[PDB]
Design a protein around this ligand. Structure first.
Ligand SMILES: *C(=O)[C@H](CCCNC(=N)N)NC(=O)[C@H](CCCCN)NC(C)=O
Lengths: 155, 38
């Protein structure tokens, strides 16, 4: 299978079938977060998906080709987390992103909480383009979870 | 071994639920790709 869309990342090494994360297939390239797969190869039916590009600091990794997703949050409008939680069906959820202010620049952040297994879920703009992936952030002075909108650099 | 299975299309849903704040946070990014609050 190679169809564009959102996928679950499953494993059988633990009890039953466990979902470790989510990813985006686009233009024949699978995109997920690095800590989901640790960079290991993946199976898509009878076929093999091999890592092609990876960076632990960005916490991104692509399979079968270079990172294709090149849309970015505009900083103004709201976005949708296409959350794909383990055991449950894909649900769009809409948010206005906040902002991670870092020494190297500011990046969007979505203040939505979902179990691990949802790491790698795509964040979308009103036009449908994937502007980043969910699952790498901080925990705030309360105890809830704020993920960055993690996006890669296309070629 | 990890395997992938499809869970949907990438599409904006026009009648989606709206939730979540828009907080502004100061963060550092270590060499391990871990965010932390400053
Ligand atoms: C996916 O593995 C999860 C997505 C958020 C689940 N946490 C929550 N609902 N509190 N990602 C993580 O848990 C992050 C682990 C990967 C860290 C990357 N170096 N942890 C954080 C703090 O984002």
């Amino acid at each position: 299978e190679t169809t564009d869309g959102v996928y679950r990342v499953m494993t059988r090494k633990l009890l039953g079938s466990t979902q470790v994360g989510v990813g985006v297939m686009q233009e024949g390239v699978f995109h997920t977060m690095w800590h989901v797969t640790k960079g290991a190869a993946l199976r898509s039916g009878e076929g093999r998906l091999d890592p092609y590009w990876g960076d632990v600091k960005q916490d991104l990794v692509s399979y079968c080709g270079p990172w294709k997703l090149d849309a970015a949050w505009d900083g103004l409008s709201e976005v949708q987390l296409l959350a794909v939680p383990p055991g449950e069906r894909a649900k769009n959820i809409q948010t206005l992103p906040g902002i991670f202010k870092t020494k190297d620049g500011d990046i969007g952040a979505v203040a939505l909480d979902y179990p691990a297994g949802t790491s790698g879920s795509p964040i979308l703009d009103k036009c449908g383009r994937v502007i980043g992936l969910y699952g790498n952030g901080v925990v705030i002075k309360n105890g809830s979870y704020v993920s960055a909108i993690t996006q890669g650099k296309r070629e | 071994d990890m395997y992938i299975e499809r869970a949907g299309d990438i599409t904006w849903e026009k009648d989606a639920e709206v939730t979540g704040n828009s907080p502004r946070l100061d963060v550092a990014l270590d060499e391990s790709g871990d965010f932390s609050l400053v």
